[model samples]
Target: HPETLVKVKDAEDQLGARVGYIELDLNSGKILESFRPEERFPMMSTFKVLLCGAVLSRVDAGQEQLGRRIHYSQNDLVEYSPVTEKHLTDGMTVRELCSAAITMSDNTAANLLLTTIGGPKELTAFLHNMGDHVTRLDRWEPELNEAIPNDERDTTTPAAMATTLRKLLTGELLTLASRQQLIDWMEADKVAGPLLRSALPAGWFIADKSGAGERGSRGIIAALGPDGKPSRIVVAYTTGSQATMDERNRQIAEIGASLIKHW
Candidate 1:
């Protein structure tokens, strides 16, 4: 087995930060390697995965219809939304909201989903029975107008995030069609940084979702893995120091590459 934990420490020392990561081997159904695995990091926008799950669960239950439409005017547009940036003045269906939420990381679309699902409280209730110890959401989207302290923001443990990704594929939390759709959108993600994906070999299919937070205080990548083999989920959450976004992302790529290197 690779001593990737040592490599991660060297990476952190060279880069100067905290990185808590987990790699779960699906075939073995256990964690293969990890570094500071218990530490919780800010989910930032990564919480979108969980939020998406909440919305999709309701869809699977027939409480929400995928064909249902939600409209927007100029007021619904939030700052920094890729959806709003499109300049389109039309309504989008719940299906479209799922696409935008995952592919574009569109804050406006996410807010719409959150609003539809009854805010963070509903998401909290969903998590309560799922047995996650370190993932939590604390506010509505615009309320995140300013960064909250780490201890009180929406967050997920590196390992816990991996579990969330795994549960989707294993039929623990989503319906077959809902899980399939979730993977499809994530595989087509448009806003993801080049971290976990950049390290993989060509033709390796990875269904992923990511969140980019402030000043590198939090950079999270949670993903399902390669197609040709019995692969796994990789979650890397980095924070607690400062660096260029690329520096942190490149380090994450290295961690991913190293895992595949020794696989």
Candidate 2:
């Protein structure tokens, strides 16, 4: 079944773009479907999800407070990045910083949250403790130029990412309320593209996070209704194609729309 799905995705040109997919039955521990989900790729802003989890875990452990203020210092700025250069002097609450990091993909906000929660070392440790091996934090570096060596950038597999999202959604990563907060923050993201949002109905509750780089993009879209029940249609897609950003985005939208039509 999984191989057939892969063939269909490939025939549609989705798999040609370095794609991955995983659908989980949260109640049954069943993997309903998957396709090339183990292939690792750079996890642009998706890393913020793990950072957010680290912060929330610290809160759960009484080591940090969600309302704590984090002052952005000059050292936090990464040259050539819009967020680091623009928000250098801002003071952001931990919660606000986390939200901005994920929702806006704000580098300064992410740095602030990273510093307050614990740098990459601590964050990676926390994620490792959560049974996530593919997800790891490299050194704190900007997305734009090669801050670190090419081989040192953070990366994760789509199956691993799906597992992380599933754990968060099922309250296996944190408390149910905490997981809801993560989802809510993702829903409030300002970076919505044509991937997940393009496929769902208006007013359908979709809590997701998206990431994009020069030639690649990825996202996890989970939907629910007013009753707050899971939609049974969780879609995870990651693509690292050779196309331009606009072209890849259009493809994502077309693929998502097609999936919805047939789903």
| All candidates: CA RMSD (Å) | 2.1, 3.6
What's model 1's overall lDDT?
Answer: 0.74
Per-residue lDDT tens digits for candidate 1, residues 41-122, read 7777777778888888999888999899888777777766876446455688888888888888888888889889898878
Global CA lDDT of candidate 2, please? 0.64
**Backbone clashes, each candidate:** 0, 0
lDDT (CA) per prediction: 0.74, 0.64
What TM-score fits each model? Answer: 0.91, 0.82
The residue ranges of model 1 lying beyond 4 angstroms of the native Cα positions read: 85-88, 142-150, 228-230
